[PDB]
Design a protein around this ligand. Sequence first.
Ligand code: HAS
Ligand code: HEM
Ligand code: CUA
Ligand SMILES: [Cu+2]
Ligand SMILES: [Xe]
Ligand SMILES: [Xe]
Ligand SMILES: [Xe]
Lengths: 33, 166, 555
Amino acid sequence: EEKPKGALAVILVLTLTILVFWLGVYAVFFARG
Amino acid sequence: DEHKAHKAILAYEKGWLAFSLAMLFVFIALIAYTLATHTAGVIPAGKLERVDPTTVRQEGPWADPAQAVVQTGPNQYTVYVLAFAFGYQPNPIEVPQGAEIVFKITSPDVIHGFHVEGTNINVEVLPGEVSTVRYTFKRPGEYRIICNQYCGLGHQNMFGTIVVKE
Amino acid sequence: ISRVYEAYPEKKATLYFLVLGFLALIVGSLFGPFQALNYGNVDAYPLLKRLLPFVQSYYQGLTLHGVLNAIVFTQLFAQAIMVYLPARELNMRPNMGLMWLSWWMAFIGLVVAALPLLANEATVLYTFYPPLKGHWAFYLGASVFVLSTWVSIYIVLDLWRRWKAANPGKVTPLVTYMAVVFWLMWFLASLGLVLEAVLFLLPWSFGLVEGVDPLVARTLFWWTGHPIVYFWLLPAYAIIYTILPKQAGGKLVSDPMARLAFLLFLLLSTPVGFHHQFADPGIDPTWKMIHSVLTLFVAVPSLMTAFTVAASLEFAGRLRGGRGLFGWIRALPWDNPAFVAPVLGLLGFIPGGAGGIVNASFTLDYVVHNTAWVPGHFHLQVASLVTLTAMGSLYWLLPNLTGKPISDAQRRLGLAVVWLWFLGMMIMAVGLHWAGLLNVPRRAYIAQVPDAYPHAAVPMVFNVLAGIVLLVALLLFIYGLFSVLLSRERKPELAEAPLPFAEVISGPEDRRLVLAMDRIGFWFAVAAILVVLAYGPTLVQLFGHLNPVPGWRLW
Ligand code: HAS
Ligand code: HEM
Ligand code: CUA
Ligand SMILES: [Cu+2]
Ligand SMILES: [Xe]
Ligand SMILES: [Xe]
Ligand SMILES: [Xe]
């Protein structure tokens, strides 16, 4: 049919989870420096 | 339909790929950043520094625990630490705040971990090798060292102590 | 007494691999709940000790857990899937002499290594890091066990070569493509362990030498030690790409995307081991940075996968009457555990991978290294995605191989098993990651020092919960697995059914792209040069300055 809205939605979630994890821990790294 | 879907999907796919690589490179940069700061001190020394684990506590920098700390700069102290089956030497390790502490840690038996609760010091300690890490405490006080690498039946109880003096 | 065995004898060998694999998963996983309670600050071990008297300590249990679950179960599942699937796709028969020799190697090797483990002679964990010295029959047993895969490599290379001959010019079929680059990858990967075992661990445990250099030993280990998890994963990916879309009522939306993913794994799976060695001495920081980069690249294949699969499930969902931006999700067959199991797996795989990419960022690793977080990370990866995939695939594979059908009762018990396992694993993953941020070390009998980690009060609750949930799930899995392997209901016609392979949507731009990727010999050689380049420099410098040290037994 058209644009894979659901697929995009999934990779969005994935993207966001990666960012909260990374930046989340990047934070803690400096907090412990 | 279906053949339409195909082009769309493969389109967005290349998009997603370009985006993903971009975000990965952003991480690559932010890592390279930390490697340029003071905080990169915790990265173990790259150079090989071989010692004999069976004579470590009989002759050398690790023999006498009363010789463990040694001022080696104007604001630099080298601490010779020994992680051994189920403890740390010296215990406690006593250091000044705001000084650069250079740890040189080894083991007379098996592999231990050297994890300083509250810091970025997290280094494996291998018998026959010196693990050299640098760190400057900012905050005072009671830092606990935890062994985080399975060493035997008393592993879970292998703690140590840092006293960083105000 | 099975004609179905006589045209498809590869069916029988496959079944032996699977059964042996699930038995190992059951035995290893018993220790799971106890280990979760332990991380909830509860000490259940006397109870275990009373049930299983041969169990001498927490650490013997954790050695059995790691070895039976992460090493044995996963390898036997790979062996079964990445030999059988390509064989059924090509409709060829695998050299059956060699197939049954590979099953014996794995079985003899297992039993040889089981003895010392069960007898508390090898309480060194699944990573067996020198100087911790296990019994010789542990190292010999494992060697033989792993070498079994070398036979499997040969068998699939053979099948490939034979198919190539009977179809000159033709592009390798998808499943067979996956399995070929899969097994070649594993060959490259396995050299690190084999070098460690042949040069150090075997002579060492036989007496021939008194020492072993710990740094080189674990550098070689992690040569193999990373790609091996990809060795665990890719059989599940093979099923998720080429079987799941059919179970979901749709199609694989891209063949060449699936090949690309697997090619990238052949290329980047091995030369990334120093990510496991960030906290080690005597390895240059530069090389660690390099390996950290290559590791973030190895994430790309799984990023691709996540889109492609998602797309295929969306597509499936739509065909089924998929409503809006989330309609397709509800339209999928949540009544079929073959579908459910790996889909949930893939859910948990999002936090899973995000954790991994943290762990891969060099300096960030110092935050979480050797802490409860890392077990948090991998149960989302192997103990969830891979294992659920495996469990789920019982619902189509088992019938195919045995002809036994699957009652509606069993199919519903399945769903329960799968939801509990998944829910249990998620709860745990929060527990472990939280605890790991609070510095709680992994590989620790922390219930034996109750007052050591008071700040991890609330995540300890989660671990206790998980432990209970997952126990139930495990019990229901045993119940349900045997109920299926212990019935005498046999429709030979479903044993003769085709595997529910999914159809692939193709495009125009495929051809040239797919053709380039089929240049297997070239890509193999490139993969090997990468290993030489990533490991060569370092290894040469470690071997120039060996410093063996004596062994120790501290259990
Ligand atoms: C089988 C399980 C294994 C996988 C897979 C795995 C993946 C990675 N890991 Fe790892 N890991 C590390 C880095 C990574 C990276 C970068 C990845 C990547 O390959 C992961 C990429 C994954 C993604 C990028 C996610 C893609 C998500 C998908 C594809 C799901 C989409 C869902 C859909 C589509 C469903 C939608 C459904 C609907 C219904 C909408 C590092 C650091 O570099 C360490 C060392 C830590 C330390 O210091 O000790 C490490 C430690 C381990 C250990 C401990 C070893 C030990 O005992 O010492 C194990 C067992 C393990 C297993 C696994 N790990 N890992
Ligand atoms: C019954 C469900 C399971 C539960 C409740 C469970 C729980 C745990 C816990 C709490 C740990 C931490 C132990 C420690 O660090 O001291 C652990 C370790 C581990 N688990 Fe699981 N697990 C389960 C199933 C699995 C499965 C299916 C796999 C692989 C397919 C797996 C692989 C591993 C590995 C490799 C380790 C680490 C071994 C080591 O560090 O030596 N687990 N498990
Ligand atoms: Cu030293 Cu565990
Ligand atoms: Cu890895
Ligand atoms: Xe081994
Ligand atoms: Xe094994
Ligand atoms: Xe591993």
